[PDB]
Design a protein around this nucleic acid. Structure first.
Ligand SMILES: [Mg+2]
Ligand SMILES: [Mg+2]
Ligand SMILES: [Mg+2]
Ligand SMILES: [Mg+2]
Ligand SMILES: [Mg+2]
Ligand SMILES: [Mg+2]
Ligand SMILES: [Mg+2]
Ligand SMILES: [Mg+2]
Ligand SMILES: [Mg+2]
Ligand SMILES: [Mg+2]
Ligand SMILES: [Mg+2]
Ligand SMILES: [Mg+2]
Ligand SMILES: [Mg+2]
Ligand SMILES: [Mg+2]
Ligand SMILES: [Mg+2]
Ligand SMILES: [Mg+2]
Ligand SMILES: [Mg+2]
Ligand SMILES: [Mg+2]
Ligand SMILES: [Mg+2]
Ligand SMILES: [Mg+2]
Ligand SMILES: [Mg+2]
Ligand SMILES: [Mg+2]
Ligand SMILES: [Mg+2]
Ligand SMILES: [Mg+2]
Ligand SMILES: [Mg+2]
Ligand SMILES: [Mg+2]
Ligand SMILES: [Mg+2]
Ligand SMILES: [Mg+2]
Ligand SMILES: [Mg+2]
Ligand SMILES: [Mg+2]
Ligand SMILES: [Mg+2]
Ligand SMILES: [Mg+2]
Ligand SMILES: [Mg+2]
Ligand SMILES: [Mg+2]
Ligand SMILES: [Mg+2]
Ligand SMILES: [Mg+2]
Ligand SMILES: [Mg+2]
Ligand SMILES: [Mg+2]
Ligand SMILES: [Mg+2]
Ligand SMILES: [Mg+2]
Ligand SMILES: [Mg+2]
Ligand SMILES: [Mg+2]
Ligand SMILES: [Mg+2]
Ligand SMILES: [Mg+2]
Ligand SMILES: [Mg+2]
Ligand SMILES: [Mg+2]
Ligand SMILES: [Mg+2]
Ligand SMILES: [Mg+2]
Ligand SMILES: [Mg+2]
Ligand SMILES: [Mg+2]
Ligand SMILES: [Mg+2]
Ligand SMILES: [Mg+2]
Ligand SMILES: [Mg+2]
Ligand SMILES: [Mg+2]
Ligand SMILES: [Mg+2]
Ligand SMILES: [Mg+2]
Ligand SMILES: [Mg+2]
Ligand SMILES: [Mg+2]
Ligand SMILES: [Mg+2]
Ligand SMILES: [Mg+2]
Ligand SMILES: [Mg+2]
Ligand SMILES: [Mg+2]
Ligand SMILES: [Mg+2]
Ligand SMILES: [Mg+2]
Ligand SMILES: [Mg+2]
Ligand SMILES: [Mg+2]
Ligand SMILES: [Mg+2]
Ligand SMILES: [Mg+2]
Ligand SMILES: [Mg+2]
Ligand SMILES: [Mg+2]
Ligand SMILES: [Mg+2]
Ligand SMILES: [Mg+2]
Ligand SMILES: [Mg+2]
Ligand SMILES: [Mg+2]
Ligand SMILES: [Mg+2]
Ligand SMILES: [Mg+2]
Ligand SMILES: [Mg+2]
Lengths: 204, 137, 159
RNA sequence: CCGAGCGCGGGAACAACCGAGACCGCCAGCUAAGGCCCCCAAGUCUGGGCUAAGUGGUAAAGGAUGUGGCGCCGCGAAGACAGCCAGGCUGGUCGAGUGGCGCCGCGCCGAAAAUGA
RNA sequence: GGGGAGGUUUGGCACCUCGAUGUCGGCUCGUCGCAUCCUGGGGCUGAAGAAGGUCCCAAGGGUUGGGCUGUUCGCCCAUUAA
RNA sequence: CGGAAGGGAUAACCGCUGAAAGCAUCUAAGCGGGAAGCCCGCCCCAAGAUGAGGCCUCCCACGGCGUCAAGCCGGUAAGGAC
């Protein structure tokens, strides 16, 4: 179960063999293993990968010991990757061969308190014949004396976006080890700068 | 004036479960769960013995029950009526089947829940080897 | 029950013979007597369900015998043109009107034989096994009720 | 009977169903209907049958080798029912019952509705 | 000719509500039932094949756009797996 | 880019062995096959799961009243807030 952290760097299109292809560019810098957790020590298998370098002063925390426990330059972030015990001490873009399809998790863009039309792509109301009061409203929300309440999970306006979103089966295109770059099939959650993880898909 | 009890040390107990009919067992477990067996009984205070059970999966049950018996878990959401047959319970967490039987026979109040804590259940056996363990049948 | 080696146990009976040994789950409330070189069995009473349990084991044991004795096997005819079957080591692949050649796995204890493209015997040590496997094949292409095709046991034609 | 006893007990809850007609007090006793496995007071009480449907936990015409119990009619050790051999009921083989009707007890089907059981 | 289920129709009764429980359509938002329109599974066929008939199992999801009318409904155009 | 694949258990239904009832029967003991449905698998939330879970790492005695016991006042550590 391959895995690797990275940051969305941007996206433009390249030309495959003779057709254009929109691709996103991720950057999965060398991720140092920080702790392998076995079923013995914990209860599952996984690996803690660090990421960006850090001012040793900013990491005055007890994290200093956690870093020392594995003897690694203080990273900025670190997340686990389930069922995946590698080799060596660092994973790289080398893990991914062009053609392999990956799942990319990320944090969608933050839209804050968004309207129902915005959030659930509702219909709203008529712009003309009707009252100029419900142009973008949800309209009805229930029945009468029965049930006489509102179903839990009713779609309504509210804080939306800015959450964990995973897009799947993105085919890995040309991957440049020379610079730790990694091209993908374009659509990938988050803003240009967001930490994203890249895993192995489930086609079979 | 009737006797006014005072602080009493928790009497633990070890109970088997092999071959024991689900309910017939749960009854006694419940009755021992509250201090309702000891003659120094007081509903107010709640001082039932810490019952600990083992070999849950072993529990017997008469007739079409593994297949018939259905358990209801209602979530707040629509159609969340999710229902599970007895066989599935023993597959997943089997300890549940005895718990959801004892829990049902304990009183409804706040101390009734405080009693459900006194009840410990596993299938192995091998309880957390504490101290007390007075076996029983 | 000649030449056999039936050995009684609590809730089961281990029968041995030339073909081998095979377990046979025996009812609880039944007496598996081993009179002489042969075997008997008797029921605790004379109730409706007990009668059923007697006759069931009465035969079910006799199968454990014959099973390790002469063994079991069922034939399989194959009608229709392209319809045929080539044995391939243990397993047998048979094209029978499908774009994909049917590869049939050989379960343990069973070893079907192919004397001819049309005929196919199924060697086995267990009536339960043999019976299923036989059907498992007829299942691959039941007898077309509008003419002769697909596999047949050895019974009448569907016409 | 409620009304006027929405005062008490039971019946899950509930004017009029079952018990009962509340002058006040009691950390006394016998009961009533209804109950005595746990929530819930008192029998996991005794003895004799029935029921494998959770029936019980509450639906009909009508249907069925469900299960148990009772009575009658036809064949049968002069070999019957069933299967296997032969001929088109008869023979042989085996060898102890077999086939049809009626009644009673409990039970199966018939049995699909909307927020969670 | 006979037994029933449902509580969508028309209705019977007058039980809460007349010191107020806003009525038909539409829109918006749905959600539930299954007695299933489609898709999945299956039995019988007067089932050759393809197509179809009737019955059984099964809500997961799906279930178009327009002309006419205030319409619900219905008719009609063009399509659909429906 | 998604609906899956896949594993498991089932519905109607198909079947193996098989008495009760010498035969016969999918069933009464037993076993196999079988759905867009059920369980799981994917994706999101999630230890107020008060039944408050696990791991890794950092800081660590008392300085004064209550005679056991539960506490109170201040300077601090790791670390946190403004
Ligand atoms: Mg960190
Ligand atoms: Mg994770
Ligand atoms: Mg609009
Ligand atoms: Mg207006
Ligand atoms: Mg206005
Ligand atoms: Mg309500
Ligand atoms: Mg930018
Ligand atoms: Mg044991
Ligand atoms: Mg529902
Ligand atoms: Mg639904
Ligand atoms: Mg313990
Ligand atoms: Mg001990
Ligand atoms: Mg046959
Ligand atoms: Mg009067
Ligand atoms: Mg009066
Ligand atoms: Mg009252
Ligand atoms: Mg009353
Ligand atoms: Mg009254
Ligand atoms: Mg009264
Ligand atoms: Mg009376
Ligand atoms: Mg009077
Ligand atoms: Mg008396
Ligand atoms: Mg009683
Ligand atoms: Mg008794
Ligand atoms: Mg009825
Ligand atoms: Mg009747
Ligand atoms: Mg009929
Ligand atoms: Mg009929
Ligand atoms: Mg009986
Ligand atoms: Mg009868
Ligand atoms: Mg004769
Ligand atoms: Mg039914
Ligand atoms: Mg009628
Ligand atoms: Mg109505
Ligand atoms: Mg209504
Ligand atoms: Mg009406
Ligand atoms: Mg009147
Ligand atoms: Mg009014
Ligand atoms: Mg008012
Ligand atoms: Mg008002
Ligand atoms: Mg009106
Ligand atoms: Mg219209
Ligand atoms: Mg249906
Ligand atoms: Mg119909
Ligand atoms: Mg299709
Ligand atoms: Mg057919
Ligand atoms: Mg058909
Ligand atoms: Mg057809
Ligand atoms: Mg056809
Ligand atoms: Mg629908
Ligand atoms: Mg849904
Ligand atoms: Mg239309
Ligand atoms: Mg119009
Ligand atoms: Mg108009
Ligand atoms: Mg009209
Ligand atoms: Mg017209
Ligand atoms: Mg027209
Ligand atoms: Mg037309
Ligand atoms: Mg057309
Ligand atoms: Mg079938
Ligand atoms: Mg068929
Ligand atoms: Mg036979
Ligand atoms: Mg048969
Ligand atoms: Mg069975
Ligand atoms: Mg049957
Ligand atoms: Mg199966
Ligand atoms: Mg299966
Ligand atoms: Mg399926
Ligand atoms: Mg599921
Ligand atoms: Mg968490
Ligand atoms: Mg916590
Ligand atoms: Mg914690
Ligand atoms: Mg220090
Ligand atoms: Mg110090
Ligand atoms: Mg010091
Ligand atoms: Mg000192
Ligand atoms: Mg400080």
């Amino acid at each position: 179960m391959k895995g690797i952290l990275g940051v969305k760097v941007g996206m433009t299109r390249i030309f495959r063999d003779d057709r254009a292809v929109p691709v996103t560019v991720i950057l999965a810098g060398p991720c140092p293993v920080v702790q392998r957790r076995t079923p013995e020590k914990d209860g599952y298998t996984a690996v803690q990968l660090g990421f960006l370098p850090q001012n040793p002063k900013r990491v005055n925390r007890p994290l200093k010991g956690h870093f020392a426990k594995a003897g690694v330059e203080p990273v900025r972030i670190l997340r686990e990757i389930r069922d995946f015990n590698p080799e060596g001490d660092t994973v790289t873009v080398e893990i991914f061969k062009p053609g392999e399809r990956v799942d990319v998790t990320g944090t969608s863009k933050g839209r804050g308190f968004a309207g129902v039309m915005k959030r659930w792509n509702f219909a709203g109301g008529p712009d003309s014949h009707g009252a100029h009061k419900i142009h973008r409203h949800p309209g009805s929300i229930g029945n009468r004396k029965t049930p006489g309440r509102v179903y839990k999970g009713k779609k309504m306006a509210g804080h939306y976006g800015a959450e964990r979103v995973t897009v799947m089966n993105l085919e890995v295109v040309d991957v440049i080890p020379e610079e730790n770059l990694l091209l993908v099939k374009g659509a990938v959650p988050g803003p240009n700068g967001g930490l994203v993880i890249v895993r192995e898909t489930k086609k079979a | 004036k009737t006797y006014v009890p005072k602080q009493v040390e928790p009497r633990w107990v070890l109970i088997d479960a092999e071959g024991k009919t689900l309910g017939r067992l749960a009854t006694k477990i419940a009755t021992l769960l509250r201090g309702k067996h000891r003659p120094d009984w007081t509903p107010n205070v709640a001082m039932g013995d810490f019952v600990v059970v083992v070999n849950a999966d072993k529990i017997r049950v008469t007739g079409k029950k593994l297949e018939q018996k259905i358990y209801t878990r209602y979530s707040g959401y629509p159609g969340g009526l999710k229902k599970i047959p007895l066989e599935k319970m023993l597959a997943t967490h089997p300890e549940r089947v005895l718990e959801h039987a004892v829990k049902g026979m304990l009183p409804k109040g706040p101390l009734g829940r405080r009693l459900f804590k006194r009840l410990k259940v596993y299938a192995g056996p091998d309880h957390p080897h504490q101290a007390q363990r007075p076996e029983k049948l | 029950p000649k030449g056999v080696s039936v050995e009684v146990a609590p809730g089961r009976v281990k029968v041995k013979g030339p073909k081998g040994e095979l377990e046979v789950p025996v009812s609880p409330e039944m007496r598996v007597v081993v009179e002489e070189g042969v075997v008997r069995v008797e029921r605790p009473s004379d109730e409706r369900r007990h009668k059923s349990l007697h006759g069931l084991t009465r035969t079910l044991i006799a199968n454990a015998v014959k099973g390790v004795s002469e063994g079991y096997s069922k034939e399989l005819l194959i009608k229709g043109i392209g319809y045929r079957a080539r044995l391939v080591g243990r397993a047998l692949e048979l094209t029978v009107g499908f774009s994909h050649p049917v590869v049939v796995e050989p379960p343990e204890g069973i070893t079907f034989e192919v004397p001819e493209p049309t005929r196919v015997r199924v060697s086995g040590i267990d009536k339960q096994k043999v019976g299923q496997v036989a059907a498992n094949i007829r299942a691959i292409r039941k007898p077309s009720a509008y003419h002769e095709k697909g596999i047949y046991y050895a019974g009448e034609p569907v016409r």
